[PDB]
Design a protein around this nucleic acid. Structure first.
Ligand SMILES: [Ca+2]
Ligand SMILES: [Ca+2]
Ligand SMILES: [Ca+2]
Ligand SMILES: [Ca+2]
Ligand SMILES: [Zn+2]
Ligand SMILES: [Zn+2]
Lengths: 351, 543, 543, 351
DNA sequence: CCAGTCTGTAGCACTGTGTAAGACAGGCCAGATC
DNA sequence: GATCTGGCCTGTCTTACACAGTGCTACAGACTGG
DNA sequence: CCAGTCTGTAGCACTGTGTAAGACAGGCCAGATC
DNA sequence: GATCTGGCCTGTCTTACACAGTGCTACAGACTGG
């Protein structure tokens, strides 16, 4: 639980308040650059290294059989855990492109070969979604599950633009939460199956999820409709009793009232939550720790490291999880002159 | 005589007068001499209320695509209702604008005078001209830098009615009812949207412009019903979007920018394949096929490598979202040609095909002696960049025979003489206001003139154009006759129009703002629109 | 029916209108409606030429002391011919000004209207009022800081005709022909000299102002012959220079500045001798005796020590050079009194004569509880300085009974009640426009009211005034009746007049400059003088 | 012949382009501050110390019997050499006060007592001038002489304001050279005597002088009338054949074309001349050396040290002689921001 | 004679700009001392 | 004989405040027709 | 018809502001190598 | 199998240029009276 102020050596005009960090096979990958992919990086995915507080970025390359990805901004990431068939993958769906349109097309990201000399190769296979497809949306969550013995994915939440009847060019930027029908995504084939549950009172947004051993826990998120951020922690239990994916849910007592959180996995099922924002006006400053097992979430309030005055007195801030208790956070630098790399970075680590 | 209230509004706006100042001077001239020479304040504003957009009830056949039918909305808050929750991308960006439809109908009702005058002149009947109307709209967007105050960048979207013609009822390939005579003067360049953003970032720019794009993509379908001269009539619309510089052209079109290897915006040629053969190409690039190519890039349906697909798709790498006519901008259009003849001469003073490896200094020597040379004869001081004035004055047969003076051989002299001669033969073919009328002679000769030019460059000066060609030169040598035939002119669509508007905007910030950025925009936009209405220019006759 | 050219000039200047803008609007209103409502440009400027100084031929009896007799010079270059030779002190400083005499005669001929009106009203003859005239001139100099543009400091010397009276032919202690009714409103504060220097450095300020001072020192001797109302008449002149803040009063007067130990500008008292006994002093200080004292310092004709002579001469250390009437400034005149009652109350909440050693914090406690107190009753947010508004509202018997609420004892309450009562009894005695007319009642009581005030401070609150007295308080308690009898008012000479003029100067620099610092000052001065002429206000009636 | 860029520790707003440095008894005294004497220094004279490139200023005090001096700006200084009666003195006359008026009253400055602790005592006796008085003027020169064996003073040169007939308030700041009648000042009593010489073609200004063994040499100066800075070096020889001070002179061949020069004495009669300005536009950059004896001036061009770029590219500059080959020069610092101590100091020394 | 109705003038909400009244500090001098 | 510290004092920064302008707005007043 | 007399407009002298066309460097990759 | 440098490419700073306003000025041009 300690911070070190980092610095942007170069390639600093390339991080935007919505972005993602893919943690797999050592080095971490930045995803969702501002502006369309330049010539320097025909893919867009970056590799990020941290060396004595310096934050360097290098240009990843791609496979040949893979597709090329548009830099989605605030999508839903899901660590498709290392197992059959092709470990280990990341499922990305669907965010919104740098033109304010949305994907409705999930992608599977994997690693192919290395090095030779500190070099990587990635691949991004577009995976079709048949069904019963889910609507394109942003801020929702995907999470992998596995039960006797099938591996599937649960998808829930998310805002969208008004459906294209009352979508008017005076409301063309207003949003509304998607209808709460959780989706189930089978990786092969994409036989998506939507389901509902009378416990899904209202679909929320920006709600960090946690899936383990075919049981998932959704924490506090944001809701525009009631304009309240409810504390009702949610749990849901899915089971593929073929040929039926029977699903049930349960409200629980305590769920933290935080949105836009940065979850770092440390142990097998130990997750330290930095958390972005407590209320709609003041962001949270403290930390949290969450264990989980077949009992449920075991809450705890770990040591909140003293943040600098500059970060604490700023309105907004964000970041990603470097993985293994290490995580990157960033604040918009508010002052003259705009560098224009106006995002100062802090590395923060547990223990 | 009491004075027409519209004239008083114009005399408050057409000369940047304040509002308090106007009242004080009005009270003065009232109390002094026995007469109400200027209308009072509130009645002047009331008399203005019908000039702004949002006053004339109109109809649309059919109802527009996802566009509310209300016809009285004034200045819409440009954010278009961003959910202000600070967890999403911030709702900071400040912008104000009209609705595309209502602004267009306002400008049309304004031009009602000239449309009725043209119906009188052409001697067309009136009970028989209620349907076949055809309006061409030239839009233009640009970034304006560093608003001058002690809120730095800005973007300004402006459209202009270019030409209105009639359709009833024969073939009527063209019946020009009204052709605007000053399509470049800012006096007719109507602002429609203003945004306190920066030109660079593609995120916020698309996020705010989106609604306007939807209006465009919905409006070309239906037709408009407007009551003018007592008769309700139907209009069509074409949108020949041109008003963009190359950088924004690419950013909207999706291609990389700027010093790319896919130079042309119309053909598919790279540096080399156009360097070798210059003037033999056909217009290919289109908006819809660029969408198609972007799809072919994203899916990569042939599993080719990075550079392999980048070559297969001709640099298409980003989903374009604003259909743009890819037309050359005649405004600069010559700085490249100018500095290119400059390099030709700086490599003629020293014999370059016998000394193809100059030093860091020998070229300095040759350019400096060329500079003192042209100071001797044409009186042209050394300059940094080929601005318009130096470009015009240098690109002359006089300076060409002047650079003859220092080149030793006498065949290179005749070569560059013929080169400059054909180039002057071919320049006003594109810089004309309408070569269909001004000088079609050189237009009919332009194909052969340009081919002789290309042959002369490839036989004489190909020491440099093996695989290298300056961007401007490709469009100026290959597609110009095609473009002129496609549109009817080149100079008559220059972005420079909205460029001249820039001054106005910043000027209006210094004397008429509120000022507090929630209202500052709204007021600048209102005053600009007032300043650019044909009506309040018809009252500033100034014979 | 055309309009008076003078009115058109006024309507160009009295509302900061530009020059190009004026021409454009004139052409508009000409071409629109059938008549020449505004005169054209060149004839307007020609019609103005007689308003500026340097037009009316005049005479001086006798010839002035070392002043060239020419009467038509316009805007003199202010440096008065500095030998530009680089080895001397640089000739950099830029300044422009009129000549004192010519500007004065211009303003007088302007006021010819009101002087003839007053001769009509008083029913005085005309063949018998050719000699006995008496003009009082109030001058005012100040520094204006940080001209706001994309040349930082500035100084502006301005005079104003205060009152003109008649002398023929009896005793005529006073025959008020014209008494200006707004002696502080910037509408009558005529600029005469402008200099791009800083207020601080005595060197360049004296270097440029010198000629003006020599002019004035030569002018009080002779008399002036001017032709007004067909009759040539003789004028005298008095120069009651007042328009200086304390700091400049000292710098011109020679005394050290500012937080000296010789507080008064009239008496010779130090901090202590005035602290013990307050209201018993007589006005002594004069310009000529200050010259004498400076001589006594410089020669040191008694071989006394440094501090010993510094005491013998009463702080006189620098040769004064501008005779200044040592007059209280009514503008602030209370910020000291206000913050002093504030300290009185901040030391009444605590018991100060029983706890004469507060901590760094106990006074913070007392002031903070006083602040919440007066927020409860008088609704006064905490401030950092006793500006004008807070000084007015706080110094009230209501707030005094409000500060009674927290003080424990009930005798201190009555003491501070009587104190504030006498203070309000005595404030309008000096802040009046003319206490000889507005409220002479409190003036006749002012001596006794002030003595009761002094006795109450020395019996109740002398815990602080042993040897300490705030500067303003000495002048407000000692000589106020003396001053009011000396002049006739106090508020009627506030420097604040030229102070308001400051917000004009910047304005004129922003819209009417040339601009290039050679001509910029010339143009600003010309337009200012135009804006402050009684004539072009008589045309802006605005009933 | 080397420079060291010094710095203004504090009390830097107190040096103006016209000033003087009195070298006597070790420490040197600055004279002619800008603006009237403040309270901090009721006299005005300063003491200056140089300590590892730092330029510190301390407040001198005065005697009790002495007069107090107005800070003249560009007066004529004369080292009344240490001898009978009361060595060693400085004669100051007359400059112009910080109000643009002139003295016409010479002052004798001497030292009285010390220390105790690094403290000094000075005295400034106003010495009356009877005659045949000189006129108040600035930029002229005074010098001491001693002829068989009487010690007198020679005074020559100087501009003034127009005599008070055509002195007009449009010419009230124009100047004209005083009439060239050299004056002889007897120090006690002040029985000044005026004299002329038909070689005194035109009175010049700012012309550095050098007096030795009842023979004086005037170098090049400035003239406004002809607007030329003549090269005609002047020599003049005075002799008190009582009761007549008979004087003669002679033009000589070479006299340097410089004005506003800074003369440092090194040898018994060896003077290194830094010089301020060669021409009316470009200031001189080089140095000079001048010996003298009963033969005359022996000229030389010593080593001109390389000045920095900003001092050579500046328009104007000035300074004084610290004495003993050490000298102080200063340039108006032209750039943003004005410190406002906009005078950078360089110490420059011979050998 | 009085209602209606206009018109002028005052006031509101907003940020940018000068001022100068106090925060202060540190630096010299007197004192307090080595 | 030589050296450091509280007193104070004044030149420097800074920040609460006043107010400038601007367009929009609402009431009060004064005309004008019945 | 012709001259005087007006009048509108073009042009001059000046700094201050935006622009973007080149100066460039440096940093990664390919190349050249350990 | 692992490491450094010339090529070049491109994002960054900077500086010559156009030109904006502004008052003053001079010329041409056109009215209007003899
Ligand atoms: Ca532009
Ligand atoms: Ca551009
Ligand atoms: Ca002041
Ligand atoms: Ca002031
Ligand atoms: Zn092409
Ligand atoms: Zn007194």
């Amino acid at each position: 639980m300690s911070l070190q102020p980092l610095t942007a050596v170069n390639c600093g005009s390339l991080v935007q308040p919505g972005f993602s960090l893919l943690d797999l096979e050592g080095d971490v990958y930045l995803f969702g650059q501002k502006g369309w992919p330049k010539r320097s990086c025909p893919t867009g995915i970056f590799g990020v290294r941290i060396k004595k507080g310096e934050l360097k970025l290098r240009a990843i390359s791609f496979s040949n059989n893979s597709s090329y990805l548009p830099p989605l901004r605030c999508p839903a990431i899901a660590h498709f855990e290392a197992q059959d068939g092709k470990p280990e993958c990341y499922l990305i769906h669907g965010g919104r492109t740098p033109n304010n349109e949305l994907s409705s097309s999930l992608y599977m990201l994997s690693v192919d070969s290395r090095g030779c000399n500190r070099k990587v190769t990635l691949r991004c296979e577009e995976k079709e979604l048949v069904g019963d497809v889910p609507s394109a949306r942003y801020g929702h969550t995907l999470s992998v599950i596995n039960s006797r013995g099938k591996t599937a994915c649960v998808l829930f939440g998310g805002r969208s633009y008004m459906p294209p009847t009352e979508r008017t060019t005076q409301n063309w930027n207003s949003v509304v939460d998607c209808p709460p029908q959780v989706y189930l995504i089978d990786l092969e084939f994409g036989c998506c199956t939507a389901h509902t549950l009378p416990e899904l009172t209202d679909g929320q947004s920006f709600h960090v999820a946690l899936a383990r051993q075919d049981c998932v826990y959704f924490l506090g998120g944001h809701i525009l409709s009631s304009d309240c951020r409810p504390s009702r922690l949610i749990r849901l239990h899915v089971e593929l009793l073929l040929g039926s994916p029977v699903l049930t849910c349960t409200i629980l007592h305590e769920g933290l009232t935080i949105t836009s959180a940065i979850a770092s996995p440390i142990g097998y099922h130990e997750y330290i939550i930095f958390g972005g924002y407590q209320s709609e006006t003041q962001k949270r400053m403290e930390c949290t720790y969450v264990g989980l097992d077949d009992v449920g979430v075991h809450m705890e309030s770990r040591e909140p490291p003293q943040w600098t005055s500059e970060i604490s007195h700023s309105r907004t801030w964000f970041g990603g999880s470097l993985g293994k208790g290490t995580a990157l956070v960033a604040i918009p630098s508010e002052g003259n002159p705009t560098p224009p790399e106006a995002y100062h970075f802090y590395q923060v680590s547990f223990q | 005589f009491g004075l027409h209230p519209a004239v008083c509004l114009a005399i408050r706006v057409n000369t940047f007068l304040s509002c308090s100042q106007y009242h004080k001077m009005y009270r003065t001239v009232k109390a002094t001499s026995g007469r109400q020479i200027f209308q009072p304040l509130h009645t002047l504003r009331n008399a203005e209320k019908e000039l702004l957009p949002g006053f004339h009830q109109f109809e649309w056949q059919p109802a527009l695509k996802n566009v509310s039918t209300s016809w009285d909305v004034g200045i819409i808050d440009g954010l278009s209702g961003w959910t202000v929750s600070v967890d999403d991308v911030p709702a900071d960006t400040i912008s104000r604008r009209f609705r595309y439809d209502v602004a267009l109908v306002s400008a049309l009702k304004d031009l009602e005078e000239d449309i009725m005058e043209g119906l009188r002149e052409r001697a067309l009947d009136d009970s028989m001209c209620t349907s076949g109307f055809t309006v061409v709209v030239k839009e233009s967007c640009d970034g304006m830098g560093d608003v001058s105050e002690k809120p730095e960048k800005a973007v300004r979207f402006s459209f202009t009615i270019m030409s209105i013609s009639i359709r009833l009822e024969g073939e009527d390939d063209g019946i020009t009812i009204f052709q605007e005579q000053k399509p470049n003067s800012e006096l007719s360049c109507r602002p429609l949207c203003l945004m306190f953003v920066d030109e660079s970032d593609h995120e916020t720019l698309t996020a705010i412009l989106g609604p306007v794009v939807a209006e465009r993509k919905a409006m070309m379908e239906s037709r408009l019903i407007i009551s003018v001269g007592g008769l309700l009539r139907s209009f069509r619309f074409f949108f020949r979007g041109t008003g963009y510089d190359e950088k924004m052209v690419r950013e909207m079109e999706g291609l990389e920018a700027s010093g790319s290897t896919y130079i042309c915006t119309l053909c598919d040629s790279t540096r080399a394949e156009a360097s070798q053969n210059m003037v033999l190409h056909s217009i290919t690039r289109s908006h819809d096929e660029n969408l198609e190519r972007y799809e072919i890039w994203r899916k990569n349906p042939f599993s080719e490598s990075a550079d392999e697909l980048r070559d297969r798709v001709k640099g298409v790498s980003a989903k374009p979202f604003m259909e743009t006519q890819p037309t050359l901008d005649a405004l600069h259009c010559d700085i490249g040609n100018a500095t290119e003849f400059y390099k030709i001469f700086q490599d003629e003073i020293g014999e370059v095909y016998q000394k193809p490896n100059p030093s860091r200094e020998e070229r300095r020597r040759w350019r400096s002696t060329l500079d003192k040379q042209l100071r001797k004869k044409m009186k042209l001081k050394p300059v940094m960049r080929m601005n318009g004035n130096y470009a015009r004055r240098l690109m002359t047969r006089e300076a060409v025979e002047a650079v003859c003076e220092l080149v030793p051989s006498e065949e290179r002299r005749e070569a560059l003489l013929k080169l400059m001669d054909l180039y002057l033969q071919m320049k006003p073919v594109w810089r004309s206001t309408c070569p269909s009328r001004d000088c079609p002679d050189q237009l009919c000769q332009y194909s052969y003139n340009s081919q002789q030019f290309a042959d002369l460059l490839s036989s004489m000066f190909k020491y440099r154009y093996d695989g290298k060609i300056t961007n401007y030169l490709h469009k100026t040598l290959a597609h110009v006759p095609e473009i002129v035939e496609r549109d009817g002119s080149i100079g008559a669509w220059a972005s420079e129009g909205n460029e001249s508007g820039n001054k106005l905007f910043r000027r209006f910030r210094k004397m008429n703002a509120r000022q507090s950025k929630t209202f500052e925009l709204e007021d600048i936009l209102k005053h600009h629109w007032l300043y650019t209405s044909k009506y309040l220019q018809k009252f500033m006759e100034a014979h």
